[PDB]
Amino acid sequence: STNLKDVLASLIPKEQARIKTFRQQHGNTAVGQITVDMSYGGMRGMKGLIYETSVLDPDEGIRFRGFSIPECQKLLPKAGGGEEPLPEGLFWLLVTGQIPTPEQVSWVSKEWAKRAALPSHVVTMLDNFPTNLHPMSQLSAAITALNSESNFARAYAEGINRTKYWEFVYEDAMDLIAKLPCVAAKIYRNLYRAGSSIGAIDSKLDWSHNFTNMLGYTDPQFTELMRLYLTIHSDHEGGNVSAHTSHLVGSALSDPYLSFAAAMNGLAGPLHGLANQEVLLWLSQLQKDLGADASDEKLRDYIWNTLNSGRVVPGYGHAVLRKTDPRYTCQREFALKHLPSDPMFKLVAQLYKIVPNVLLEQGKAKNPWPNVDAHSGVLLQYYGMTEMNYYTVLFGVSRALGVLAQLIWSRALGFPLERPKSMSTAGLEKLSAGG
Amino acid sequence: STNLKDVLASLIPKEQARIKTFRQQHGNTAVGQITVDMSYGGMRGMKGLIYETSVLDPDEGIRFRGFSIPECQKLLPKAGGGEEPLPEGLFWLLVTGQIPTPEQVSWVSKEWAKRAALPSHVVTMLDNFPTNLHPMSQLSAAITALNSESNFARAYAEGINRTKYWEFVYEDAMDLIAKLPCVAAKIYRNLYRAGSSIGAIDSKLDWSHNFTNMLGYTDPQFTELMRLYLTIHSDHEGGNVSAHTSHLVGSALSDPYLSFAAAMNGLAGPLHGLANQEVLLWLSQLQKDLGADASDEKLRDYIWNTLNSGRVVPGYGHAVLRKTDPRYTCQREFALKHLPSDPMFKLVAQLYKIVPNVLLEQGKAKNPWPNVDAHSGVLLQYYGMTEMNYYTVLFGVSRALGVLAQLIWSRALGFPLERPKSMSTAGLEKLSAGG
Ligand SMILES: CC(C)(COP(=O)(O)OP(=O)(O)OC[C@H]1O[C@@H](n2cnc3c(N)ncnc32)[C@H](O)[C@@H]1OP(=O)(O)O)[C@@H](O)C(=O)NCCC(=O)NCCCC(=O)O
Ligand SMILES: CC(C)(COP(=O)(O)OP(=O)(O)OC[C@H]1O[C@@H](n2cnc3c(N)ncnc32)[C@H](O)[C@@H]1OP(=O)(O)O)[C@@H](O)C(=O)NCCC(=O)NCCCC(=O)O
Ligand SMILES: O=C([O-])CC(=O)C(=O)O
Numbered sequence: 001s002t003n004l005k006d007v008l009a010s011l012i013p014k015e016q017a018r019i020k021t022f023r024q025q026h027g028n029t030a031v032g033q034i035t036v037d038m039s040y041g042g043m044r045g046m047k048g049l050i051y052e053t054s055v056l057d058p059d060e061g062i063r064f065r066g067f068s069i070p071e072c073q074k075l076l077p078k079a080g081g082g083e084e085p086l087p088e089g090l091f092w093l094l095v096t097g098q099i100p101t102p103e104q105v106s107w108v109s110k111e112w113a114k115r116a117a118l119p120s121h122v123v124t125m126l127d128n129f130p131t132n133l134h135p136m137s138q139l140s141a142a143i144t145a146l147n148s149e150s151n152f153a154r155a156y157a158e159g160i161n162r163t164k165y166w167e168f169v170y171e172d173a174m175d176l177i178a179k180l181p182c183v184a185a186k187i188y189r190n191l192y193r194a195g196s197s198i199g200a201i202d203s204k205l206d207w208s209h210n211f212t213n214m215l216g217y218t219d220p221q222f223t224e225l226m227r228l229y230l231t232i233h234s235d236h237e238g239g240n241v242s243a244h245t246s247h248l249v250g251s252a253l254s255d256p257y258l259s260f261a262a263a264m265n266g267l268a269g270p271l272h273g274l275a276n277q278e279v280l281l282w283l284s285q286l287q288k289d290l291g292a293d294a295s296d297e298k299l300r301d302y303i304w305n306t307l308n309s310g311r312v313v314p315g316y317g318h319a320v321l322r323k324t325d326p327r328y329t330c331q332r333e334f335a336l337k338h339l340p341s342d343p344m345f346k347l348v349a350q351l352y353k354i355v356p357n358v359l360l361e362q363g364k365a366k367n368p369w370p371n372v373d374a375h376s377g378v379l380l381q382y383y384g385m386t387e388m389n390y391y392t393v394l395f396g397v398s399r400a401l402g403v404l405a406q407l408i409w410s411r412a413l414g415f416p417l418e419r420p421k422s423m424s425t426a427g428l429e430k431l432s433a434g435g
Numbered sequence: 436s437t438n439l440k441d442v443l444a445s446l447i448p449k450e451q452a453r454i455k456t457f458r459q460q461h462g463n464t465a466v467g468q469i470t471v472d473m474s475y476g477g478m479r480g481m482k483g484l485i486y487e488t489s490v491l492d493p494d495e496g497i498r499f500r501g502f503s504i505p506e507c508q509k510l511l512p513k514a515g516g517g518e519e520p521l522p523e524g525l526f527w528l529l530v531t532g533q534i535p536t537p538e539q540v541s542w543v544s545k546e547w548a549k550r551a552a553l554p555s556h557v558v559t560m561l562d563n564f565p566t567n568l569h570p571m572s573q574l575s576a577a578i579t580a581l582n583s584e585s586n587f588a589r590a591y592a593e594g595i596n597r598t599k600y601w602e603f604v605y606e607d608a609m610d611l612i613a614k615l616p617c618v619a620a621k622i623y624r625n626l627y628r629a630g631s632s633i634g635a636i637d638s639k640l641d642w643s644h645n646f647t648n649m650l651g652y653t654d655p656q657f658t659e660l661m662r663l664y665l666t667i668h669s670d671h672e673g674g675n676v677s678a679h680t681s682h683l684v685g686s687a688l689s690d691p692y693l694s695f696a697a698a699m700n701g702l703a704g705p706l707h708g709l710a711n712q713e714v715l716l717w718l719s720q721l722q723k724d725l726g727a728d729a730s731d732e733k734l735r736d737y738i739w740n741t742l743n744s745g746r747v748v749p750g751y752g753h754a755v756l757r758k759t760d761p762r763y764t765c766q767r768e769f770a771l772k773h774l775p776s777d778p779m780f781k782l783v784a785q786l787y788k789i790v791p792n793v794l795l796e797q798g799k800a801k802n803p804w805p806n807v808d809a810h811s812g813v814l815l816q817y818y819g820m821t822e823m824n825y826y827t828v829l830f831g832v833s834r835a836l837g838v839l840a841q842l843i844w845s846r847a848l849g850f851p852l853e854r855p856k857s858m859s860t861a862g863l864e865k866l867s868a869g870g
């Protein structure tokens with residue numbers, strides 16, 4: 001009865017026509033200009049990609065198909081007896097643009113339980129990895145190795161006509177999302193619970209719940225945290241490193257497994273998703289140097305020392321946002337509800353009063369406000385997940401939802417190879433005169 | 436006496452100042468505009484990145500630090516008794532902008548022989564990979580797994596000041612280049628010469644020669660082919676998928692191993708470097724359907740059938756080039772010198788007379804001329820390297836030179852996070868009015 005693939009079959013042709021006519025009328029309309037500073041500046045400020053699933057406003061923050069986080073919290077189906085949105089529903093919304101029914105949501109949950117199975121070569125590789133190999137590296141290498149199972153790769157090799165690419169992309173997308181929690185849980189267990197097993201998928205539970213059971217957590221509030229975490233980390237428009245990387249790579253017709261693994265190597269950068277890990281490590285050194293209950297003057301000194309040493313303060317700043325990330329606020333609210341007296345949470349709250357002021361004073365950051373990474377691990381730590389080097393993997397699992405949602409659309413719409421022109425400093429000086 | 440690291444130490448500060456002042460004068464100067472069609476079109480035509488090592492002219496083809504291929508052939512140091520340029524020299528030129536001496540070239544060769552060593556976890560992983568796992572996937576997963584050895588990753592974790600990033604990037608770059616041929620040869624042997632060993636590095640040979648010895652080839656002309664192949668595939672300005680991917684990923688401070696592995700997943704796409712493999716497979720089906728000596732009319736029919744089936748003709752077309760790729764010409768010339776009567780070569784030559792005309796007739800391709808991939812495998816096949824699924828790995832090994840050369844510079848120059856703004860179709864329609 002419910003079948004997202006059939007729903008997409010109807011939606012594709014209409015969007016295709018809509019875009020066709022618009023481009024007919026406005027393809028040559030200019031939307032902006034390119035300046036020297038933007039080229040040297042990592043395209044900061046350049047409108048460069050079409051990405052359908054979410055759009056970020058610099059002041060208001062992210063919108064998923066037009067809905068803000070608070071709206072998602074309110075509109076998306078929850079677990080029975082739950083308060084947090086199920087990521088399955090968010091996936092539905094991103095892919096279709098429509099809020100799903102709980103019946104639609106449960107089908108996604110069953111579909112994902114049904115497709116979760118790892119091939120042995122992958123299992124063996126994970127099991128043979130050394131404990132000093134970072135969790136993100138183990139995750140990316142496993143996803144890359146799963147490409148032997150790609151249906152898009154196989155169909156492409158068979159010569160399928162380009163109009164059908166989306167269909168195979170959708171299958172690999174659904175299968176990769178289904179398998180991600182098993183890959184992730186397996187790395188968790190091998191590294192931190194050696195000799196134990198992830199167990200089996202219960203076709204009757206939501207994806208976050210099967211994930212937390214494979215991780216070994218029983219707290220019901222932890223399951224709630226997971227549902228929220230996985231929903232909010234899902235997508236952040238297309239120009240963020242991980243999403244842009246999946247987009248660019250997939251544009252060459254690399255399969256979804258290869259596109260997602262490349263994205264993960266981008267998420268593992270300290271200026272991107274690895275910040276979630278870095279925040280915790282900075283905080284632990286904080287509490288170690290200054291010890292648990294610090295004074296404001298002492299926190300400032302600590303912050304200044306980081307800045308003075310040629311390092312960034314993790315968890316603050318943003319390439320597009322210019323105000324406090326609603327994702328940080330949404331986490332703060334969860335903390336205030338569930339772990340209001342945790343000392344680490346209290347520390348994170350105190351830095352909110354300090355850090356922005358120091359950054360402002362330093363005068364370099366364009367956005368002195370906190371971003372999502374400043375508040376994520378604090379939550380995790382409270383529930384017993386103290387392995388900070390593993391935090392980015394969870395962001396990785398979440399991010400698959402948004403990037404894979406968009407990837408289906410890129411191929412449905414026929415987006416071509418992403419290939420901008422580059423320039424050398426010498427060539428550019430000549431183009432202008434020099435300086 | 437020779438030490439590239441000391442040479443770069445002097446060059447950095449001067450380039451830094453040069454760029455600083457230029458941006459002072461022209462940072463706000465507009466270099467182009469962005470249109471709707473460019474956003475929907477994979478940034479085709481957008482000047483979007485600064486990339487120093489090479490620049491591609493749409494009519495003339497690639498220039499490496501200002502030199503064309505013919506000039507490199509003529510200027511770069513050759514092996515004793517050789518005719519083809521040594522890739523070590525090309526690496527020197529890209530990194531420094533200056534043509535190296537043969538003494539400088541030999542130091543690079545020794546440096547790379549000295550740093551070539553694989554850690555056991557990597558060896559074990561390769562040895563346990565199934566034979567159905569594509570060679571590019573095995574290569575990318577191994578490079579990702581080598582990141583446990585990263586010096587940049589380690590220094591970053593220790594808190595190094597940002598001004599010194601380049602120094603660590605340079606070390607990981609030199610080490611990754613040194614190890615690449617061992618990773619690559621090991622996949623070659625495991626897959627196609629099961630039970631044999633890659634052997635050891637001879638500190639006295641050039642990098643291409645140690646590579647061909649690990650692959651198991653003795654023909655001296657094969658060694659020459661390898662030197663040319665590895666030099667020409669080295670870099671192709673910054674907006675090509677693989678280079679852009681390394682650039683974007685490295686912009687987040689991910690280490691060179693993670694940045695290069697993500698690039699490789701982009702090179703493995705059929706519209707990018709995998710075309711080299713695809714050309715051979717298309718050709719083999721050709722000769723199989725039509726059998727060895729075909730008539731022109733028959734080749735045309737074969738070509739039209741591919742086009743009519745919703746597929747591309749591999750090896751033809753380009754996102755920027757608008758004339759025949761000098762890299763294809765440079766290969767043709769090698770063929771004419773060394774294997775002029777090979778039937779496959781003859782077939783490739785015949786398609787040169789046919790394909791462009793059919794593409795023109797079809798009227799879709801903007802560039803109906805051949806690209807580098809149309810002539811690479813033909814050369815390989817003649818020397819006995821008939822494993823077409825492995826061809827992209829060789830391109831991968833070559834490409835490390837250009838992208839890693841640039842990566843050092845990106846960090847030396849302090850390029851920030853690559854983060855453009857994205858837009859949805861809906862948002863864009865509104866920005867304009869709609870259509
Ligand atoms: C996120 C970001 C990389 C954005 O970069 P960008 O758009 O270039 O920031 P910007 O325009 O404000 O940078 C201007 C200057 O302020 C500095 N600055 C910005 N944020 C800073 C911070 N948190 N700490 C210290 N300095 C900072 C920049 O590094 C830059 O300095 P230089 O001119 O000397 O290079 C940056 O704010 C940063 O480094 N933040 C800390 C890392 C972090 O929290 N990353 C997580 C982001 C969310 C995610 O992806 O998960
Ligand atoms: C290389 C490239 C992806 C460039 O793409 P792009 O810049 O979009 O080409 P373009 O502007 O000429 O495309 C216009 C149209 O011509 C079509 N076309 C272009 N090259 C074609 C080819 N070789 N065979 C069939 N159709 C082709 C395009 O796919 C596009 O069709 P649609 O409008 O229906 O989408 C394209 O020429 C192609 O697909 N070539 C075949 C694959 C190939 O050889 N790749 C290797 C490139 C070199 C490398 O990276 O190693
Ligand atoms: O938006 C970006 O640049 C980074 C970010 O917060 C994300 O990807 O979640």
Ligand SMILES: O=C([O-])CC(=O)C(=O)O
Nearest residue numbers: 419670671674675676754
């Ligand atoms: O220039 C590009 O777009 C593709 C290409 O030929 C390469 O990367 O060698």
